[PDB]
Design a protein around this ligand. Sequence first.
Ligand SMILES: Cc1noc(-c2c(NC(=O)[C@H]3CCCC[C@H]3C(=O)O)sc3c2CCCC3)n1
Length: 130
Amino acid sequence: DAFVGTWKLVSSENFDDYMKELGVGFATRKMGGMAKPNCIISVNGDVITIKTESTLKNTEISFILGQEFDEVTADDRKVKSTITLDGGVLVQVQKWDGKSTTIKRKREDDKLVVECVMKGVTCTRVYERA
Ligand SMILES: Cc1noc(-c2c(NC(=O)[C@H]3CCCC[C@H]3C(=O)O)sc3c2CCCC3)n1
């Protein structure tokens, strides 16, 4: 849809603080902090796939909207994730150990904008088409 494509990270605000709030250790925060990943979003039938590709770490999820799935995150959390579409925004929640974090992906002008919340920390990451 509006999301399908190959997206390159161009700006990031508060990602270190977001990772720290998640409990991510120094080494993984070091990898994450200056990484400029590609995000590759595709759809086939009911199934959306999101690939996150970067020099030191790649991840991938495939899911059906509204159907919970197990995910191993880039920081090695074992979480239960659910993704839905709410007013054109792809809203992902990850739940683990009584905690949750939300990752919202929206299209704004030429941008894929990703808002990441953990407790009182809000990170915003902006991608543009490769
Ligand atoms: C947590 C966590 N811990 O590490 C990483 C991580 C990435 N997280 C995201 O990009 C996602 C998922 C988190 C919100 C931003 C998202 C997005 O913008 O799509 S990219 C990357 C790393 C660590 C290794 C180097 C490359 N997330």
